[model samples]
Target: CDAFVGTWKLVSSENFDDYMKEVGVGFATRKVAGMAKPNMIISVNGDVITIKSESTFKNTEISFILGQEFDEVTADDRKVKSTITLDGGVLVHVQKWDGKSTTIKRKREDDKLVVECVMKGVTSTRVYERA
Candidate 1:
C-alpha cells in the first residue's frame, strides 16, 4: 500500500538469527547481521515496487512488479527468483534458490510495518517504526 512508501527502522526483531541460519548464511554474515539495525525504504513507481535496505553491515535493493518473478541477489549473496504479491493489504514476498525457498510477509499495522520472514520451520518477526 502507499502507506508503506517511507523509511522504516527496526523497532524489534525475534528469531532472525535462526531464520538466516536456515537460509545458509555463514557465521560471519550472521554475526554482523544479528547486530545490525537496518533501515528500509519503500517506494513505488507506477505498478512497480522498490524496497531498499540499508545498514552498517550491508545494503541491498529490490524492484519488481506485483505477481511477476524477478531475479534478485540477496544480502547473503544468494541469486534467487523472487515474487512479490499482494494479499489484502499484505505484501507477500517469496524467494527461491538452491532448491530452497523462503517467504516474507510484510504488513502495515497501525503506525508500524511488521515483517515476517519464514525459512524452513523457522520464522522471524521484525517490527519497524516509520521514519
Candidate 2:
C-alpha cells in the first residue's frame, strides 16, 4: 500500500471525443483533464481507502473499501455515485447524471503503484512514486 500513497501525474488520454463533435465538456474539460496535469494522493488505513485527486481546474476526494461498496458525492457535489467491484482489484464507479463511470485499478510494480482508469472505453494509466 505504501507504493500507492503518493502523487501521480497524468500522462496521456484517448477516445476524448476529439474536439467538438458533441458538446457539454467543450474543449476545456478534456484539456484540463488531459494536459492540465493531475495529482493523486492515496491513503490506506486498515480497510479504508481514501483518495484525493487534484488538477488545475478541479479537485475531488473519495473514500472506499478494498472489496466493499459505497456511495460518493463528487467534489463539485453535483452527482452521487456508487462503486462496484471489478476484476484485478479494480473498482468500477458508476455515477448519477450523465457522467461516465470510472474504473480504478491498482497494482504494485517494482516499488511503484500502477493505476489504471477506464471510462467510456478510454483507458488512462498512471504510474506513481512515493513522496
Candidate 3:
C-alpha cells in the first residue's frame, strides 16, 4: 500500500480499446479513450484508500476501505459493485455489473506501477511511471 501512494503517468498501454469494448463502452468513448493518456494518483490512510485517474476526457475517483465492498461508477460510465483487497503486494479490484465481472490488478515493479485489467475475454495492461 505504501509503495502505491504516489502519482503516476501513463507510459505504456496494450489493447485498451478492446478491453473497453468488452466492458460495453460505446464506440465514441472507446475512440477517445484509446488516445487518452491518463494520470493515476493513489493515497492510503490506514485501512482506507483512494485513487484518482485523470485525463483530458474524463476523471474518475474511487475510495474504499480494505476488505469492504462499495459502489463504483467506472470511467467508461458503468455502475458496479466493487471491492478491493491487497495480496502479496498487489491490489486486486473486483467489479460486478450486469451479471458480468471484471478484475483489475495494480502492483509496483521496480520504479513503475503496472495495471492489468480483464473483462470478458479481453485483457489489457497499462504501465505507469512515477510522476
Candidate 4:
C-alpha cells in the first residue's frame, strides 16, 4: 500500500443522480451530498486499511482488511458487505448488496490517483489530483 498511504486529494466527483434515479431513492439527499466534495485520506496499517472520507457534511471512515469483507454502512444508509483487495497493484473496493454490485477501483497514476466509480453493469472514471 505504499502508493496508497498518506495521500489526500483536493476534489472528487460523482454523477450519482444517474445512479440514484435508477433506484427510487430521494433525489434531494443526493444533491445535498453532491453539494460537498470529498477529500479522502488513505492509511494502511499492515494488512488493514482505513479510508478517511472528509467533507463539509459529517465525516466517516471505512475500515477494511485486505481480502476480507466488512460491514459498510453506505451513504444511503444501506448496510453493505464490502471489501478491499490489492488487485494488480491497485486497491479495488467492492460492495455487495441485494443482487447489486458496485465496484470502485482506485489506482495510482504518477502524481495523481484515478478512480472508477461503477455501478452494476455501468462504468465511469474519476481522477483526483494530490493535495
Candidate 5:
C-alpha cells in the first residue's frame, strides 16, 4: 500500500459540477460541496482497505475487501452496490446506482494523489497532495 496509507487534501478539481449533476446531486448539495475542501485518510488493515472522508458538509468512512460486493450509501444519500479493487498502484471503486455505473480511481503520482470520477458522460478529476 505504498501509494496509499496517507492523509491527502484536495487541491484542485475539474468538471465536478457536471459530474455531480449527472449523478443526480441536487442544487443545494452541489452549492456547498464545492465550497468545502475535503480530506481523505486511508489505511489498510489486513485484507481490508478503509478510506475516511472529511469535509464541512459531510463525513463518511467506507471499507472494502478486495473483490467483494457490498452495499453503500453515497454522501448525497444515493444507495448503491459498490466494489473496490486494487490494480498495481491504483485503487478503483465501481458503483452501481439507479441502473447507472460510476467508476472512481485513486492513484498516486509522485507526491500527489490523483482521483478521477466518471459517471454517465461526465468526468471529474481531483488532485490532492499529502497533508
Candidate 6:
C-alpha cells in the first residue's frame, strides 16, 4: 500500500528541558508536550513530499521538494517560514519561527525511522518503527 510506505508512529522520545529552556518553550508548554506523542508521516511521489506531524495537542503538515528549500508550518501550528529538502537519504528541515529557527533531521536505520530535532542547543530524538 502507498500508505504503508510513509506512515510513522512514535516508539520513543527524549526530553531535553535544557534545550527547550533555551528556546523559551516555557515550563508550562514543556510540561504539556512531554506526555504528548508526536507522530510524523511522509508521502513521496517523484520529487515531491508531503509530511504530517500529529499529536493529541496539535497536527502539522509540510510539503517540500527533494533538494530544494520551501516554506512549512511549525509543530505548534505556527508557520515555519523556511526551507526543507532531502540531502542524500536524510530529510533536513530548517524552520524559522518568530526570528528563531531550527533544523530537523530524519533518516531510516535498522528498519526504523529516526527523527531528531536540534533547536536552541537542545536535541530531541524520536524513533518510529513500521506499523
TM-score of each: 0.97, 0.62, 0.97, 0.86, 0.96, 0.79
Error of 5 at 56 (Å): 1.0
Q: What value does the lDDT take at residue 121 in candidate 2?
A: 47
How well is each residue in 1-131 modelled by candidate 3, as lDDT tens digits? Answer: 77899999999999999999888899999998899999999998888899999999899999889889999988777889998999999999999988899999999999989999998789999999998
What local lDDT score does residue 5 receive in model 4, on the 0 to 100 scale? 76
* Model 2 score (lDDT): 0.57
RMSD of each: 0.8, 4.2, 0.8, 2.0, 1.0, 3.1
Q: Is candidate 2 or candidate 6 better by TM-score?
A: 6
TM-score of 3: 0.97
Compared with the true structure, what per-residue lDDT tens digits does model 6 show for residues 1-131? 13325778888887555556565666776776666777768787766777787898677776666556666645444566767666777777777778998777888888788878888668988788776
* Structure candidate 3, residue pairs in collision: none
Residue pairs in candidate 2 whose N, alpha carbon or C atoms collide under 3 angstroms: none
Measured on C-alpha atoms, candidate 4 has an lDDT of 0.74
Q: Count backbone overlaps in model 2.
A: 0
Kindly give the stretch of ten consecutive residues in candidate 5 with the minimal lDDT sum.
1-10
- Pitting candidate 3 against candidate 6, the one with the higher TM-score is 3
> Candidate 1's residue-wise lDDT over 1-131, tens digit each?
67789999998999999999989999999999999999999999999889999999999999889999999998889899998999999999999987889999999999999999999899999999987
lDDT of 4 by residue, 1-131 (tens): 76887656645555656655453347776776656567778887887788887887557789778888889877667677888888889988888888777888988888777787777555555666767
**Better by TM-score, candidate 6 or 1:** 1
Ten residues in sequence with the least summed lDDT for candidate 4: 16-25
lDDT-best of 4 and 6: 4
Instruction: State the displacement of the C-alpha of residue 35, model 5, in Å, after optimal TM-score superposition.
Output: 1.6
Candidate 1 segments exceeding 4 Å error: none
Off by over 4 Å in 2: 1-3, 9-25, 74-80, 84-100
Better of 2 and 3 by lDDT: 3
